[PDB]
């Protein structure tokens, strides 16, 4: 509670760490392969919780 | 509105939804009615159709 984010290149809404792993920007991705950060950056399951 | 030198006769068809009275005499036809057959078509595990 004394800082905002440890890194700002993945925590904001349009960050590099977001656009690598969000569901809205993987619309040209290969659907088969697995990515572990999809359990963190994905908008639907972050909002499912 | 000058009348030209030729006369015309319009032809149009008018489709009419009518009602028809049907008659028959006494003992016109002879209905040979047989006993119906039953065949289980769908042998479903929820409800069976015959």
């Amino acid at each position: 509670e004394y800082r905002s984010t440890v890194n700002p290149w993945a925590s904001q809404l349009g960050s590099l760490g977001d656009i690598m792993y969000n569901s809205s920007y993987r619309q040209t991705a290969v659907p088969g392969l697995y990515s572990p950060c999809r359990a963190f950056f994905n908008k639907e399951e972050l909002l499912r919780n | 509105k000058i009348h030209p030198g030729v006369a015309m006769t319009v032809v149009r068809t008018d489709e009419i939804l009518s009602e028809n009275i049907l008659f028959s005499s006494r003992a016109s036809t002879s209905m040979f009615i047989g006993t119906p057959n039953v065949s289980r078509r769908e042998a479903r595990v929820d409800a069976v159709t015959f």
Partner: protein, 287 residues
């Protein structure tokens, strides 16, 4: 024999799901049971582009099925044997025609993706029914969409060559058996590209094959009569190219001509016998 297949839905459903199965009871869907892979719902997922050749080769890979009933959790449907005849309705978002056509086609809906895709928010299965349409209607709409996307990509390259009004006067209006229908608008892009490379490889391949088979029958009536017709502008430039690039051209040429010949053949080829207008149904067997 019960040809019926049972599928259990995952969760509970609601009202307009019943309304949209009552809309789509008559129309049909392919097969792989497993509630995810029921039909074309693994190709129309938007994380990949909905392509035509992958969906078409899947549709020719799997069998077909008639949806029959949807209860609170069950999906009662029967599949297609080549043996006995089943009853088919239209129930399609284009409502085209059945005037006694003895040959049918089953193609994925090029007129609308969302026109045949039915969606449920509780169940993400996004199932979809490929458009059943008669064979002259099928060939006319596939021509009038393939040449349309060819013209669209050519205008995107150079707009000064092709226009839109004179092509919407003709290539947007299919007309078959007195009925004049209207249609206008990735998958057709790549399908056109396969045809684009096949029709540009067909000249060199054609002159190479007629130069190989030109003097087999040393005085033939038929061979000379097929040699007298084609283009004098075409048969010059063959011997300049190396061997391996030539045979790679012919190999890719043969693969995609076999692919596009089987693709221009209408895939799942149904056949109807007697169509009832007042019930909007016909009897069909697989052919």
């Amino acid at each position: 024999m019960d040809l019926k297949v049972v599928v259990s839905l995952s969760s509970r459903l609601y009202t307009d799901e019943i309304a949209k199965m009552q809309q789509r009871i008559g129309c049909i869907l392919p097969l792989a049971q497993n509630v995810q892979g029921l039909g074309l719902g693994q190709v129309y997922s938007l994380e990949t582009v909905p392509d035509y050749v992958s969906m078409y080769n899947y549709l020719s890979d799997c069998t077909l099925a008639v949806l029959d009933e949807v209860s609170v959790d069950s999906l009662i449907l029967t599949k297609i044997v080549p043996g006995q005849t089943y009853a088919i309705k239209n129930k399609y978002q284009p409502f085209f025609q059945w005037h006694g056509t003895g040959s049918l086609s089953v193609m994925p809906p090029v007129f609308g993706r969302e026109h045949a895709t039915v969606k449920l928010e509780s169940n993400d299965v996004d199932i979809v029914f490929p458009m059943v349409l008669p064979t002259p209607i099928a060939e006319e709409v596939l021509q009038k969409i393939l040449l349309f996307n060819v013209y669209s990509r050519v205008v995107m390259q150079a707009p000064g060559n092709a226009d839109m009004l004179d092509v919407h006067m003709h290539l947007g209006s299919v007309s078959y058996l007195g009925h004049h229908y209207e249609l206008a608008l990735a998958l057709l892009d790549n399908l056109s590209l396969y045809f684009c490379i096949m029709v540009t490889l067909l000249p060199r391949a054609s002159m190479r094959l007629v130069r190989g088979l030109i003097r087999h029958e040393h005085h033939d009536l038929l061979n000379l009569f097929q040699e007298m017709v084609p283009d004098e502008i075409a048969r010059i430039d063959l011997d300049d190219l190396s061997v391996a690039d030539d045979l790679s051209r012919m190999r890719v040429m043969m693969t995609y001509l076999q692919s596009l010949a089987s693709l221009f053949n209408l895939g799942p080829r149904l056949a109807t016998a007697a169509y009832s207008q007042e019930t909007l149904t016909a009897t069909c067997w697989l052919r």
